[PDB]
Design a binder for this molecule. Structure first.
Ligand SMILES: *[C@H]1O[C@H](CO)[C@@H](O[C@@H]2O[C@H](CO)[C@@H](O)[C@H](O)[C@H]2NC(C)=O)[C@H](O)[C@H]1NC(C)=O
Ligand SMILES: OC[C@H]1O[C@H](O[C@H]2[C@H](O)[C@@H](O)[C@@H](O)O[C@@H]2CO)[C@H](O)[C@@H](O)[C@@H]1O
Length: 588
C-alpha cells in the first residue's frame, strides 16, 4: 500500500517540517530519491488506523510517549544502529525509545515546557504560582492578563498538577505499575484546585487554545505563556523581547513538566526500511541536518551529543533543561493513550465547572486502568477508545443526571460494515444502529442514560468516539423522579407535598454498567395495616415483567439488565410510606 524508492514522513504541524523537507531535498539531490513531508492534523490518533492497514508513511515523528503503543500494535519496525552511531547520542534518549528491550524509534530531541514571559511588561517574573492572581489584578488595572497557555491539551496543565504530589504510572521495581498512577492524589487535586481557582476568579478563560494563547502572547496581550522550543520560532518574528525561565512553584514544590523525546519511528510495512535508516542516521541526525530543522522551529535539547554542546550555550535551552530536570520523563508505553484522554477530560470537565476537582480526577484515575468495555458515566465529556478491544463485543454505558441529554461524535472508524460490524446506541426512548458513514456525525439520547454496543470481528477493528451532555431542551421527568446508577449504592423513597401534582407516582431509575445485573435489598415502612392500594413496582426498562410489592416489609429483587427502574405508587405517596435499602451489581 506504500511504494518503493521514495520516503513519506508525518511530522507534527507545530514543528519545523519546512526545515526537515529541506533535509529531504538535499537527501533527494545526493541520494537521488524523493522525500515527501506531510503534517496532517491528529496524526497521533490517525497513524495507528492507517499503518495498521499496512498503508501510512515510511517515517513518523512524535514524542516517545505514543511510540510504545505503536510498537505494541506491530506498526513500528526495530531500529538497530551500530555502537558507533548509538555513541553519538545521549544514551538517556535511547532509554526513552526502548520498548521490551528493543529500540523502536530514533531519538531526535528532548523537549520540556519552560515559562515564557514578556521581559517588557514583566521585568522579574513570579517564583510561586500563588503570586499570579495578585499579578493578574495588577495587570487587569493596565488592561492585560498575567498568563495565557493552552488549557485544552493536558501536556500544558500537567506541570502544575504534578508540582506537589501527582504522578502517572509509578516506577516500582524498575517497571511501570499500571495499577498505581497518581492522578487522584491530594497533591494533584490541590494542584488542579488552583488552576480552577484562576478560571473561577476570572484570571484564565476556561477555554484558551494553543493558537489563542500563541497569538495572545505574541501580540503582547498577555504577560506569560507556557510552551516548548517549537514556539520561540514565531515569538522571535514578533520582536517581543521574551524570556524563557524556570516554571513557577506550587505549595513550595517546583512545577513538574513531562519531558518529551521527539523520536522518528519507522513503519513496519515500509518497503523502504534501508533508506529511512539511511536518511535519519546519515542525513537528519547530523549537525548540518539538525541545524536546518532547529532554524524553522527550534528543536531544543537534541539527541546528537556533537551538536547539543552548542545549543547548551543559548540560555533558552538551559531554562528548558532546568525545567526538564524538575519534571519526569514521559512513560514510553501504550496505556499512556488511556492516561492522556482520562486527564484531558478531567481538566476540561472540571475547568468547565461541570465537575468537582475530586470527582474529575477520581474518574480520570479509574479511566487509566484496564479495558474500555466497562461503564463511563457522570462525566460532562468523555473519550471512549473502543478500537481493537479484547472482545469486539465492546458494550459501554453513559449516565448523566435527570434534566440532561447525551451528545456523541464518532472520531475514527475501522469497522468492516459488510461482515456485520456496526455501532448501536440503545436509549430509554432512543434507538439507532449504524456503520458506513458514522464519522463526524453528532448523535443524541432524549434522556440521561445511553449505551453503545460495538459488534466488530476485526481484531483491531473498533471506533474512537467523544461524547458530551447538554441542558434539557424541553424537560419532562416531574422532578421527584430520582436517578441513582453506580456500581452499588443507597436507596431512599422520595416524597412530595399534599398538593403539588398528585397525579402520577415518582419513579427511580438505577442504570448500571453493561453485562451486569442490579440487585435490590430494601425494607419499607409506614404502609400500615382485593389488594387495597399504594404499592411499589420494579422492572428492567426494556421488559414487561413488573414485580409489584403490595403491603410489604422487606423486599429483594434482581434485574436481568444494566437498565432498571422502580415506580412508587401515587397511592403509596398519598398514604405517606417510606423505603430504604442498598443496591449492587457485577453478576453476569
Ligand atoms: C467483510 O468484507 C471484507 C472486504 O474486504 C471481506 O474480505 C474479503 O474476504 C474474501 C475471502 O472470502 C475476499 O473477497 C477477500 O479476501 C477480501 N476482500 C478483498 C477485496 O480482498 C470479508 O470476508 C467480509 N467479512 C466476512 C464475514 O467475510
Ligand atoms: O495529551 C497531551 C499530549 O502531550 C504530548 O503532546 C505534546 C508533544 O509532546 C509535543 O511534542 C508537541 O506536539 O506538543 C504537544 C502538546 O500539544 C504527547 O506527545 C501526546 O502524546 C499527548 O497526547
Amino acid at each position: 500500500k506504500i511504494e518503493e524508492g521514495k520516503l513519506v514522513i508525518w511530522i507534527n504541524g507545530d514543528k519545523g517540517y519546512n526545515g526537515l523537507a529541506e533535509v529531504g531535498k538535499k537527501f533527494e539531490k545526493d541520494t537521488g530519491i524523493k522525500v515527501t513531508v506531510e503534517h496532517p492534523d491528529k496524526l497521533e490518533e490517525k497513524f495507528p488506523q492507517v499503518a495498521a492497514t499496512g498503508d501510512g508513511p515510511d517515517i513518523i515523528f512524535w514524542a516517545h510517549d505514543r511510540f510504545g503503543g505503536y510498537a505494541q500494535s506491530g506498526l513500528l519496525a526495530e531500529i538497530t544502529p551500530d555502537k558507533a552511531f548509538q555513541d553519538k547520542l545521549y544514551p538517556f534518549t535511547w532509554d526513552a525509545v526502548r520498548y521490551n528491550g528493543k529500540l523502536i524509534a530514533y531519538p531526535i530531541a528532548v523537549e520540556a515546557l519552560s515559562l515564557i514571559y514578556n521581559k517588557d511588561l514583566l521585568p522579574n517574573p513570579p517564583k510561586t504560582w500563588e503570586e499570579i492572581p495578585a499579578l493578574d489584578k495588577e495587570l487587569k488595572a493596565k488592561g492585560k492578563s498575567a498568563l495565557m497557555f493552552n488549557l485544552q491539551e493536558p501536556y500544558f496543565t500537567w506541570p502544575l498538577i504534578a508540582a506537589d504530589g501527582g504522578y502517572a504510572f509509578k516506577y516500582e521495581n524498575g517497571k511501570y505499575d499500571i495499577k498505581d498512577v497518581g492522578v487522584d492524589n491530594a497533591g494533584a487535586k490541590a494542584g488542579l484546585t488552583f488552576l480552577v481557582d484562576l478560571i473561577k476568579n476570572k484570571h484564565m478563560n476556561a477555554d484558551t487554545d494553543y493558537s489563542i494563547a500563541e497569538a495572545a502572547f505574541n501580540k503582547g496581550e498577555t504577560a506569560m505563556t507556557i510552551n516548548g522550543p517549537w514556539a520561540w520560532s514565531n515569538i522571535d518574528t514578533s520582536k517581543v523581547n521574551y524570556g524563557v525561565t524556570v516554571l513557577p512553584t506550587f505549595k513550595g514544590q517546583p512545577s513538574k513538566p513531562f519531558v518529551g523525546v521527539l523520536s522518528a519511528g519507522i513503519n513496519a510495512a515500509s518497503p523502504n526500511k534501508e533508506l529511512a535508516k539511511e536518511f535519519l542516521e546519515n542525513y537528519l541526525l547530523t549537525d548540518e541536518g539538525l541545524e536546518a530543522v532547529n532554524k524553522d522551529k527550534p528543536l531544543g535539547a537534541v539527541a546528537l551529543k556533537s551538536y547539543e554542546e552548542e545549543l547548551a550555550k543559548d540560555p533558552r535551552i538551559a531554562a528548558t533543561m532546568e525545567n526538564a530536570q524538575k519534571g519526569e520523563i514521559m512513560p514510553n508505553i501504550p496505556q499512556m493513550s488511556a492516561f492522556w484522554y482520562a486527564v484531558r477530560t478531567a481538566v476540561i470537565n472540571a475547568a468547565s465547572g461541570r465537575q468537582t476537582v475530586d470527582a474529575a480526577l477520581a474518574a480520570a484515575q479509574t479511566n487509566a486502568a484496564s479495558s474500555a468495555c466497562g461503564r463511563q458515566h457522570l462525566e460532562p465529556t468523555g473519550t471512549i477508545d473502543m478500537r481493537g478491544p479484547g472482545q469486539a463485543d465492546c458494550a459501554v454505558a453513559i449516565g448523566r443526571p435527570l434534566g440532561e441529554v447525551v451528545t456523541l461524535r464518532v472520531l475514527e472508524s475501522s469497522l468492516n460494515c459488510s461482515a456485520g460490524d456496526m455501532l448501536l446506541l440503545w436509549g430509554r426512548l432512543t434507538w439507532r444502529k449504524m456503520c458506513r458513514k458514522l464519522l463526524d456525525m453528532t448523535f443524541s439520547s432524549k434522556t440521561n442514560t445511553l449505551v453503545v454496543r460495538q459488534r466488530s470481528g476485526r481484531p483491531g477493528g473498533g471506533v474512537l468516539l467523544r461524547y458530551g451532555s447538554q441542558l434539557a431542551p424541553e424537560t419532562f421527568y416531574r422532578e421527584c423522579d430520582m436517578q441513582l446508577f453506580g456500581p452499588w449504592g443507597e436507596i431512599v423513597s422520595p416524597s412530595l407535598s399534599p398538593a403539588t401534582s398528585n397525579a402520577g407516582g415518582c419513579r427511580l431509575f438505577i442504570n448500571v454498567a453493561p453485562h451486569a445485573r442490579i440487585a435490590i435489598h430494601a425494607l419499607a415502612t409506614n404502609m400500615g395495616a382485593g389488594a387495597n392500594a399504594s404499592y411499589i413496582l420494579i422492572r428492567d426498562t426494556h421488559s414487561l415483567r413488573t414485580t409489584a410489592f403490595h403491603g410489604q416489609q422487606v423486599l429483594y429483587w434482581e434485574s436481568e439488565s444494566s437498565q432498571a427502574e422502580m415506580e412508587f405508587s401515587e397511592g403509596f405517596l398519598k398514604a405517606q410510606a417510606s423505603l430504604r435499602g442498598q443496591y449492587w451489581t457485577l453478576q453476569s
